[PDB]
Design a protein around this nucleic acid. Structure first.
Ligand SMILES: [Mg+2]
Ligand SMILES: [Mg+2]
Ligand SMILES: [Mg+2]
Ligand SMILES: [Mg+2]
Ligand SMILES: [Mg+2]
Ligand SMILES: [Mg+2]
Ligand SMILES: [Mg+2]
Ligand SMILES: [Mg+2]
Ligand SMILES: [Mg+2]
Ligand SMILES: [Mg+2]
Ligand SMILES: [Mg+2]
Ligand SMILES: [Mg+2]
Ligand SMILES: [Mg+2]
Ligand SMILES: [Mg+2]
Ligand SMILES: [Mg+2]
Ligand SMILES: [Mg+2]
Ligand SMILES: [Mg+2]
Ligand SMILES: [Mg+2]
Ligand SMILES: [Mg+2]
Ligand SMILES: [Mg+2]
Lengths: 332, 97, 123
RNA sequence: CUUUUUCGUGAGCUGAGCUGUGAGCUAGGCAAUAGUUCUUUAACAACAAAAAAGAGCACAAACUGUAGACGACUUUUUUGCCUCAGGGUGCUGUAAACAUGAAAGUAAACUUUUACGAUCUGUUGAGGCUUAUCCCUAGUGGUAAAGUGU
RNA sequence: AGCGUACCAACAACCGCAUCAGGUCUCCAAGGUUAACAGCCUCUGGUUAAAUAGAAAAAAGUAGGUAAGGGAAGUCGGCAAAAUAGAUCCGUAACUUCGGGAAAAGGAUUGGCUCUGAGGACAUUAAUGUUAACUCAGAACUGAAACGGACAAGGGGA
């Protein structure tokens, strides 16, 4: 996660009070460098739940993938993944044949590339991505062609699509009932203080119940949110990645002075309508809908008229740095 | 072995959190800690003129920057002396041995 | 004393805090009581000096005995609301240490016949 | 235990085939005894001493603030990081000093000359400040102790 | 002639069970701003000590500060807080024991700088000189319209 900005768009809703007008909306920017596909894993069904057969790895892996297996890499001999990748291919093909024969779910193991971001961390993040589609043989032939390549983001999603978002909310520590749960604040005359709950329960269930709100820890919770729409997929090879047909100033997505508390975004990215849980730099997981939406909003396609790139430090007044020097003329 | 160093320290970075009655002693404590950690010496002595300079504006707002000189002597075999350097501008100064 | 390592509090630990240095002892609570350490160091120095006289090599000494006993307490007062007076005692102790030098069927003729027959039967 | 002999079954031997291993066919010679029963010491799994055949990491430490009452958590330890500086992006609102520049008026030598004067103007969109939880930079100087467990 | 004469007088030497935030009688009394021995700052004299210190800094408390739009809808009840306050110049009702009510209610002004005017004494002649001390009126300029700038200081009415 990088930051937010706003855009200008023309509405196309017959029947609305805003049918033919220009409006302003807020958006969130996610930095989306490509991942790398490094392995395969297959599951089969049992009455005890899904069950792993085996894991097959690719022929070479990178050092930022290996750092995730160490609590301190700087003092180590770094021998992880140094024997197992030297197996003959015959064993791997026999294992893949078994997976084709007995398994019902395939997933692909992929990892991120934090060196292309402004992050201080060097360990990569690892996750499993399920592969839906045809028969198991077709799935297997699909995955193997990718086993040591890059996934760009536009291979996975499309413009104007609807997405779900998974992440962890911002932390706040220990908070009281008034803030944690939103209870009615108590009169000024109260003797031991007023920020509490007056009655914890009736006499006689002679215990406190688990539905009574108390003090405790607030924030840093795990959440899944539905139906966030995609407005644009940018590309790092594109000079005018924040310009429209109505505004031909040649611009990038990063505002004057850098995204505050993040840095400069110089890979390809996503622009999402709305907001997303987490701080700056927080990793965001993206998923397709459980079943596809067919409503009018999820099918409508968006044309943008203005992306804003003025400074978010203070109250910015220019769209580029050249405007600023042109306005004042020569200084001292 | 002995060595001499010239550095500048900005104190508003270090006193930003404390209240009015603690702004100058916090700066003094930070100077001592920084010098000791940069010289690897547990024994750090502060010259009285530097202490006088730090308190020149009262307890409430010490100066925003200070330039000091650090020398390590042979006397717990070694120790560090910290003195004050008077400058009329901090603009170009970086640190040197 | 220098807070490089801690002492795990396993017995009298009501309200003692949690610390990062207790994981070394597979525990969660610890503290750094300096006065106790100084008092114990004085006695260990005395033990070593007494071992120098009777010509033992210090490198092989092992503390085989450590015993702490509580002594008669001293007495002071403290004052409380509504004109009351309450005790303000202390808690002294005894200590003793020892170090030591370390290196590194019945015949029963009837029973004999039974045993012989048993051993014969298994072959 | 000898003798005469058959068939399966595989180590070394390529359904040649000796022999290992089991099951039989002839003809014979040779044992068991503790004085009337006291659980018929009989299974399964371990361990120890000898003889032969086989041979790495985590904690701590200094940083970090996406975390926080303390523990815990997220990070880095040489293209990294800390530091100071340069640059960017913002906040305030035009610094100190000079000017025989202005200024309602005043008094004091003989058209000017000297004196006092709130405030105003020029050099001046100037001066100051900006991460401690802002952004960029193989820019400067650094990057310490050898402890604990397994 | 005889008797008293050291020291504390509370800040730990007195009474309160104590080296207790309580109680306990007299005299002296500087500068600035002001009506002021008030409040705030200072010179002489006194001190920098209190049954503890370091770091961190979230709930909750206690002593404080601010808050868009509304303005008592809160509560038994405007409890708590807010609003007003000094001087000068104007203007003040019902009722009344004619003395009051009354600061009734209400309205305007207030800095800095440069000027003008008015209030005494003395000694030689309607003239001439020598000299003070604080008040009170008026005018022109000046500033991000501010000026009892902090301190101090009535809410009113039926
Ligand atoms: Mg009450
Ligand atoms: Mg902002
Ligand atoms: Mg520029
Ligand atoms: Mg008490
Ligand atoms: Mg009492
Ligand atoms: Mg017998
Ligand atoms: Mg000036
Ligand atoms: Mg930093
Ligand atoms: Mg006397
Ligand atoms: Mg006397
Ligand atoms: Mg008594
Ligand atoms: Mg007292
Ligand atoms: Mg006291
Ligand atoms: Mg508070
Ligand atoms: Mg305010
Ligand atoms: Mg309000
Ligand atoms: Mg009401
Ligand atoms: Mg009500
Ligand atoms: Mg009241
Ligand atoms: Mg009245």
């Amino acid at each position: 996660k990088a930051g937010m900005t706003h855009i200008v768009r023309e509405v196309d809703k017959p029947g609305s009070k805003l049918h033919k007008k220009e409006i302003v909306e807020a958006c969130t920017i996610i930095e989306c460098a490509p991942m790398v596909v490094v392995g395969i894993v297959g599951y089969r069904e049992t009455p005890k739940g899904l069950r792993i057969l085996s894991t097959v790895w690719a022929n070479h892996v990178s050092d930022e993938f290996r750092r995730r297996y160490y609590k301190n890499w700087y003092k180590s001999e770094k021998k992880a993944f140094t024997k197992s990748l030297n197996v003959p291919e015959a064993t791997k093909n026999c294992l893949l044949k078994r997976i084709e024969k007995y398994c019902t779910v395939l997933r692909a193991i992929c990892h991120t590339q934090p060196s292309k971001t402004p992050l201080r961390m060097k360990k990569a993040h690892i996750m499993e991505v399920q592969i839906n589609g045809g028969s198991m043989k077709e799935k297997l032939e699909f995955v193997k062609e990718m086993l040591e390549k890059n996934l760009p983001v536009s291979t996975v999603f499309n413009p104007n699509e609807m997405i779900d978002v998974i992440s962890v909310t911002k932390g706040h520590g220990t908070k009281g009932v008034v803030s944690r749960y939103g209870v009615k604040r108590l009169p000024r005359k109260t003797h031991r203080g007023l920020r509490k709950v007056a009655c914890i329960g009736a006499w006689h269930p002679a215990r406190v119940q688990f539905q009574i709100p108390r003090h405790g820890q607030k924030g840093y919770f795990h959440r899944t949110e539905r139906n966030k729409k995609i407005y644009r997929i940018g590309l790092k090879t594109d000079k005018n990645s924040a310009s429209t047909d109505a505004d031909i100033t040649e611009k990038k997505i990063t505002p004057m002075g850098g995204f505050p508390h993040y840095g400069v975004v110089n890979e390809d990215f996503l622009l999402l309508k709305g907001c997303v849980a987490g701080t700056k730099k927080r990793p965001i997981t993206l998923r397709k809908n459980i079943v596809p939406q067919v409503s009018r909003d999820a099918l409508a396609q968006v044309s943008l008229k203005f992306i804003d790139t003025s400074s978010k430090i203070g109250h910015g007044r220019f769209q580029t740095s050249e405007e600023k020097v042109k306005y004042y003329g020569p200084l001292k | 072995k002995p060595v001499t160093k010239f550095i500048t320290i900005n104190l508003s970075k270090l006193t930003h959190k404390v209240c009015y009655k603690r702004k100058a002693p916090r700066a003094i404590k930070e100077i001592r800690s920084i010098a000791g950690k940069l010289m690897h010496t547990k024994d750090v002595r502060l010259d009285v003129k530097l202490n006088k300079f730090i308190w020149s504006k009262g307890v409430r707002n010490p100066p925003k920057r200070v330039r000091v000189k650090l020398e390590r002597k042979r006397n717990e075999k070694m120790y560090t002396i910290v003195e004050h350097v008077m400058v009329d501008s901090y603009k170009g100064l970086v640190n040197e041995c | 004393i220098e807070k490089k390592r801690c002492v795990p509090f396993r017995k009298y630990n009501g309200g003692v805090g949690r610390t990062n240095q207790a994981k070394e002892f597979n525990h969660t609570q610890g503290r750094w009581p300096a006065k106790s350490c100084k008092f114990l160091l004085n006695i260990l120095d005395n033990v070593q000096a007494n071992a120098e006289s009777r010509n033992l090599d210090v490198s092989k000494l092992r503390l085989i005995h450590v015993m702490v006993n509580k002594a008669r307490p001293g007495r002071r007062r403290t004052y409380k609301a509504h004109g009351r007076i309450n005790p303000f005692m202390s808690s002294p102790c005894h200590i003793q240490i020892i170090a030591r030098e370390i290196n590194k069927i019945s015949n029963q003729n009837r029973l004999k016949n039974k045993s012989v027959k048993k051993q014969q039967t298994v072959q």
